[PDB]
Amino acid sequence: SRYEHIPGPPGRVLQDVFLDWAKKYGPVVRVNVFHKTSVIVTSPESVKKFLMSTKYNKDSKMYRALQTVFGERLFGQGLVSECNYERWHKQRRVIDLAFSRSSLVSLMETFNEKAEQLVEILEAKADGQTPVSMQDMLTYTAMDILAKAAFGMETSMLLGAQKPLSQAVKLMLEGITASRNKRKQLREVRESIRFLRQVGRDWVQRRREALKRGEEVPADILTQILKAEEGAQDDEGLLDNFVTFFIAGHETSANHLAFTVMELSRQPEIVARLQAEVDEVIGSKRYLDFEDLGRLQYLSQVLKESLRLYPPAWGTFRLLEEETLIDGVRVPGNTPLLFSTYVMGRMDTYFEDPLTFNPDRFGPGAPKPRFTYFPFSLGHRSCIGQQFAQMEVKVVMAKLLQRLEFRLVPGQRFGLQEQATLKPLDPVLCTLRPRGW
Ligand code: HEM
Ligand SMILES: Cc1cnn(-c2ccncc2N2CCC(C(=O)N(C)C)CC2)c1
C-alpha cells in the first residue's frame, strides 16, 4: 500500500519492460526488482540530483546478491558492494592510486600484447568459413588482460588454459542471476564462489612470498588492494576486493567488446570509416602508443554509441531516506531509487530516433547528453575502472579493425540477455577474412 499511489502497471530483458513503463507512466514508476519494490526515476533532473551528491548513498539491500550468494561470501564489502560512505571512501582513495594517468599509461604494453595475441589467433582462422565465437574470444582476451594488468598473473585463457576457472566464473554469474530471479545448481554455484576466493588466497600468498624473497613486484591494482587492508584483523576484506576486481575488471569490458563487434557486423559504412581511421592513425604499426588512442576520435564515438544502446551495466540504486517529491510524485522514505542508462538511452524524449546507431551523436560539434547517458555511472560512485576499460577496448578494437573483416553468421541474433550484466544473447558467431581479401 505505501507505493500503490505511484504511477505504474496494474532477447528481451526486464530493462525493456521498464523502458515500456517509463514511456507509458512517466519519469517516476513503481517496479519490482531483485524481489524488492523500487522506483525507477528517468528524468535528467533526478539523475543529477541523486547521483551528483554524497548525501545519497547506495541502497545496500539492492547489492545483497553481489555480497553473498547461497550463503557463500562473493564481493562481500569490496569497492562495488560497500554502501557505507566512510568505509567505501577509505578504500576508494587508496585503490585510486592504481588508476592514476601514470599507472594506466604503464598498462599499454599488456593491452597491446594480449590484443596482438588475439588477432594472431583470429587471423589463423580467417578462411571466410570457420565460425568463431567473438563473445568467447573477447572474454578470454579481457580475462587475460585483467589477470596480467591487475594481479601480474598469466591466466592464458587465449591458449585454452584455466578451463575450471572459466567454468567457476560462468556458474558464479548464473548464481547472481538465479539469486535475483536445485541441489546440483546450489552445489555448483557454492563451489565456484569458494574456488574464486581460493584463487585470491593462492595469488595473495604468491605475492607475499615474492615480496619476502625480495623479488621485483611492479605496483598494480593488487598492491593497492593489499595497501587498503594494511593492519586489518584478517584477509576477508582483501579477498572481497580481489574477487571484485577479478570479475568486474573483465566481464563488462568483454560484454562491451562483444556488443560493439555484433552491432558493427550490420554497419558496413561505419566499419569502412573505422578501418580508414586506423589506417591513417597507426598505419602498419604493430603497437598502439598512448598518444595514438586520443587520435582514434571516430572509434571513440562508435564506442560511446555502443554504450548508449548496449550498456553492460544498466544503472545503479540510491537509498531515499526521507519522503521526497520527485517530478510531482510523492516517494516514501526508505525507498530504493533505480537509475537506468539503458532505459534513458532508448527514450525518444532524450535521444532522437533512439534505435538508430549514429556515432555522430558524440561528434565534436554535437551537444553532449546532459544526465541522460551514464554507462560508467556518475558522481562519487562512478566506475573506478572507466579509463582502464576505455583504453583496453580501444586497443583491442583498433587491432581488430587493422587486420580483419567480420561477417556475422546468418541466424545470429542482436538480442540481449541479463546475467549479472547485459550481454549478447548469442555467441556473436562470425566468419573472418584478412583485410585486403
Ligand atoms: C566497459 C566497461 C565497464 C563498464 C560499462 C562499467 C560500469 C560500471 C558502473 C555502471 C559502475 C557503477 C556501479 C554501481 O553504481 O553499483 C561501476 C563501478 C565499478 N566498476 Fe566498472 N565498468 C566497466 C569496467 C570496469 C573495469 C575495467 C573495472 C576494474 C578494473 C571496474 C571496476 C568497477 C568498480 C570496482 C566499481 C565500483 C566503484 C566504486 O563504487 O567506488 N569496472 N562500473
Ligand atoms: C558481477 C559483475 C560483473 N561485472 N560487474 C561490473 C564490472 C565493471 N564495473 C562494474 C560492474 N558491476 C555491474 C553490476 C552492478 C550491479 O550488480 N548493481 C548496480 C546492482 C554493479 C557494478 C559486476
Question: DSSP label at 242?
Answer: H
Give residues with Cβ within 8 angstroms of 209, minimum separation 6.
none
CA contacts within 13 A on the Cβ side of 191: 9
| CA of 191 relative to ligand 2 center, distance in Å | 21
**Around Cβ 233, how many Cβ atoms within 10 Å?**
7
Residues with CB under 6 A from ligand 1: 79-80, 92, 244-245, 248-249, 252-253, 256, 312-313, 316, 375-377, 381, 383-385, 388-389
What is the number of structural domains in the chain? 1
Q: Using an 8 Å Cβ cutoff, are 132 and 125 in contact? A: yes
Within-domain flag for 7:
no
- 11: in domain: no
- Amino acid identity of residue 102, one-letter, is S
Nearest to 208 by CA among 235, 185, 181, 187: 235
For helices 221-228 and 183-212, the axis angle rounded to 10 degrees is 90
Of 309, 311, 305, 316, which is closest to residue 41 (Cα–Cα)? 316
How many H-runs (helices) and E-runs (strands) does the chain carry?
Answer: 16, 13
| 3-class DSSP assignment, residue 381 | coil
Q: Which atom of ligand 1 is nearest to the CA of 221?
A: 30
Question: Could you give the CA distance from residue 29 to residue 26 in angstroms, rounded to a whole number?
Answer: 7
Can you spell out the DSSP letters for 279-320?
HHHTTT-SS--HHHHHH-HHHHHHHHHHHHH--SS-EEEEEE
How many other CB atoms are there within 10 angstroms of residue 31's CB atom? Answer: 21
Is the CA virtual torsion 158, 168, 426, 146 positive or negative? negative
SS3 at position 217: coil
Of the candidates 301, 376, 314, the residue with the CA atom closest to the CA atom of residue 345? 314
CA distances in angstroms from 193 to 69, 155, 200, listed in the order given? 8, 18, 11
Cα-flanking dihedrals φ and ψ of residue 335, to 5°?
A: -125, 135
259 Cβ partners below 8 Å, 6+ apart? Answer: 306, 309, 310, 312, 423, 424
Contacts of 377 (CB under 8 A, 6+ apart): 51, 313, 315, 316, 339, 341, 383
In a domain, residue 305? The reply is yes
323: phi then psi, degrees, rounded to nearest 5: -55, 135
CA separation for the pair 150, 135 (Å, rounded): 22
* Cβ–Cβ < 8 Å for 431, 129: yes
Sign of the CA dihedral 62, 65, 71, 77? Answer: negative
User: What is the position in ligand 2's atom list of the atom closest to the CA of 317?
Assistant: 19
What is the maximum alpha-carbon separation in the chain?
A: 66
3-state secondary structure of 138: helix
Pair 150, 245: CB distance under 8 Å: yes
Residue 383 annotated as lining a ligand binding site: yes
Cell of 11: 532477447
Distance set, CA 144 to CA 88, 138, 155, 276 (Å): 28, 10, 6, 29
Q: Cα separation of 111 and 408, whole Å?
A: 25
Which structural domain range is residue 221 located in?
Answer: 16-434
**Closest to 165 measured CA to CA, from 191, 145, 128:** 191
CATH code of the domain in which 309 resides: 1.10.630.10
Q: Which residue, 351, 348, 339, 332, is CA-closest to 313?
A: 339
Do β-strands 315-320 and 329-331 pair in parallel, antiparallel, or remain unpaired? unpaired
For 405, phi then psi, to 5°, come to -115, 135
Residues 312/255, Cβ–Cβ less than 8 Å: yes
Cα–Cα distances in angstroms (integers) from residue 237 to residues 40, 240, 251, in the given order: 32, 5, 21
Among 385, 424, 138, which residue's Cα sits nearest to residue 306? 424
Q: Which of 59, 107, 252, 383 to mutate to test the pocket of ligand 1 (most atoms within 8 A of CB)?
A: 383
User: Contact at 8 Å (CB) between 236 and 279?
Assistant: no
Is 3 within a domain? Answer: no
Taking 3-state DSSP, the helix, strand and coil percentages for the chain, each rounded to the nearest 5, stand at 55, 10, 35
Going by C-alpha positions, the residue among 107, 309, 326 that lies closest to residue 220 is 107
CA-CA distance, 40 to 188, in Å (whole number)? 34
Does 32 fall in a domain?
yes
| Residue 105 resides in a domain | yes
Residue 89 forms part of a structural domain: yes
Q: What is the DSSP string of 339-370?
A: EEHHHHHT-TTTSSSTTS--GGGGSTTSPPPS
Give me the residues paired with residue 335 across strands. Answer: 320
Contact between 433 and 405 (Cβ < 8 Å): yes
Which residue is closest in CA terms to ligand 1's atom 25? Answer: 385
Picking from 423, 105, 28, the residue whose alpha carbon sits closest to that of residue 251 is 423
C-beta atoms surrounding 37 within 10 Å: 15
279 domain-assigned: yes
| Structural resolution in Å | 1.7
Report the candidate in 341, 343, 262, 340 with the shortest Cα–Cα distance to residue 307.
Answer: 341
Q: After which residues is the chain broken (C to N over 2.5 A)?
A: 10, 181
Name the DSSP class of 434: E
Residue with C-alpha cell 556488443?
Answer: 259
Q: How far apart are alpha carbons 416 and 433 in whole angstroms?
A: 26
